[PDB]
Amino acid sequence: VSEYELPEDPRWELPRDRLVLGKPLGEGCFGQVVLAEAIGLDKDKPNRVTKVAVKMLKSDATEKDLSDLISEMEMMKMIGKHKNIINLLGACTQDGPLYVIVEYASKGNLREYLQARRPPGLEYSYNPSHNPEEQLSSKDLVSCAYQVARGMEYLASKKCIHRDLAARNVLVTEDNVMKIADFGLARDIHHIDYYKKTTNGRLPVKWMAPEALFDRIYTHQSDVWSFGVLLWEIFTLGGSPYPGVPVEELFKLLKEGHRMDKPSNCTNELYMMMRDCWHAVPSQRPTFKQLVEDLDRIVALTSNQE
Ligand SMILES: Cc1cc2cc(Oc3ccnc(Nc4cccc(CS(=O)(=O)NCCN(C)C)c4)n3)ccc2[nH]1
């Protein structure tokens, strides 16, 4: 029995013997995510199995870690469901460690998904996958961007600021639906280390708007700046931002007006949309509502023949 009072919500609680735990999906310093099969997740369909992702704490986990995971779960309930975010499906709070059960995205994060779909040749770096998949169409790429914009428009409408929107935090389902992840994470109460890599080797400083970098100010406008970086990641098919640029240099550069150059395969229109997201002045960036409307139009005009 836990020493803590884990919050049981009858609408969401699943007996944990309805979960058949499967392979690890990922592990961080937080805990771990595993794939599972859930039996009768939908009450009206008790005999059906659903593949799901299950988040749980490491054994080394503290009380703040627990509080953080509960917090993510409750924030997700409050934000509600949208097609282009990772949605809550249930929880196990009784009879063992806390499990938070969410939609499963079988194709993993967007950066690695795009990298494995890199065609040969001059416009992209090499494909690092030993199981490369069919390359995407131009329309497919704009449609990835559109779906992420639509998810952020929803989150913004629910007053959620993501604060680390990046291709690594977009997951892709079996049906190639884009789903924003890690939007419900607690904001650390301590100052951050700008030079500390994630468990997957990423430096989050490269997605920060200048006002976030400089003064730790995060708003929907600073998420639009990150979406501009994410756009650049899409049209480089998973490229790494500011190539050759040491991180301790980045703010100076940005402040002087430095911006990433256009990816080799990227329309003038989509590069101008990136640059607009990277407006120095937060009030002058487009909103996610505007981004969605423009990307909708651009998707309809973009060829899926190549
Ligand atoms: C409460 C909560 C639960 C939760 C679960 C999350 O993870 C989820 C949720 C839904 N689906 C997937 N699918 C998935 C499939 C393959 C691999 C991965 C992990 S990965 O880091 O993107 N790539 C694996 C190895 N790379 C580093 C080489 C995830 N994960 C992510 C955030 C979450 N927040």
The angstrom resolution of this structure is 2.0
Tell me how far CA of residue 28 lies from CA of 25, 41, 63, 236, 294, in angstroms.
Answer: 10, 26, 17, 26, 36
Q: Please work out whether the CB of residue 86 comes within 6 Å of at least one atom of ligand 1.
A: yes
Taking the C-alpha atoms of 199, 200, 203 and 208 in order, what is their torsion angle to the nearest 10 degrees? Answer: -100
The label of the residue with tokens 């280390």 reads: 193
Q: Please work out whether the CB of residue 28 comes within 6 Å of at least one atom of ligand 1.
A: no
Tell me how far CA of residue 279 lies from CA of 46, 200, 209, 257, in angstroms.
Answer: 51, 29, 9, 9
Residue 74 in marked binding region: no
All CATH 1.10.510.10 domain ranges of the chain, comma separated, are 108-301
Q: Please work out whether the CB of residue 105 comes within 6 Å of at least one atom of ligand 1.
A: yes
Choose which residue among 21, 25, 106 to substitute to test ligand 1 binding: the one with the highest number of ligand atoms within 8 A of its C-beta. 25
How many residues are given for the chain? 306
Ligand 1: nearest atom to the Cα of 26: 19
Tell me how far CA of residue 163 lies from CA of 76, 213, 218, 226, in angstroms.
Answer: 16, 11, 6, 8
Question: What is the DSSP code (8-state) at residue 13?
Answer: B
Which residue, by CA, sits nearest to atom 34 of ligand 1? 182
- Name the active-site residue from 164, 188, 193, 294: 164
Residue 140 annotated as catalytic: no
Q: Please work out whether the CB of residue 33 comes within 6 Å of at least one atom of ligand 1.
A: yes
All CATH 3.30.200.20 domain ranges of the chain, comma separated, are 1-102
Q: Please work out whether the CB of residue 74 comes within 6 Å of at least one atom of ligand 1.
A: no
Experimental method: X-ray
Q: Is 108-301 assigned to CATH 3.40.50.300?
A: no
Please give the structure tokens belonging to residue 124. 């992209």
Q: Reduce the DSSP state of residue 85 to 3 states and report it.
A: strand
Distance 245 CA to ligand 1 centre (A): 28
Choose which residue among 19, 30, 33, 65 to substitute to test ligand 1 binding: the one with the highest number of ligand atoms within 8 A of its C-beta. 33
d(CA 223, CA 3): 38
Q: Which residue, 258, 269, 235, 213, is CA-closest to 117?
A: 235
CA 225 to chain centroid, in Å, comes to 15
Please give the CATH topology (third level) of the domain spanning 1-102: Phosphorylase Kinase; domain 1 (3.30.200)
Residue 91 in marked binding region: no
Q: Which residue, 71, 73, 79, 279, is CA-closest to 161?
A: 79
Q: Reduce the DSSP state of residue 24 to 3 states and report it.
A: strand
Which residue, by CA, sits nearest to atom 23 of ligand 1? 108
d(CA 45, CA 29): 36
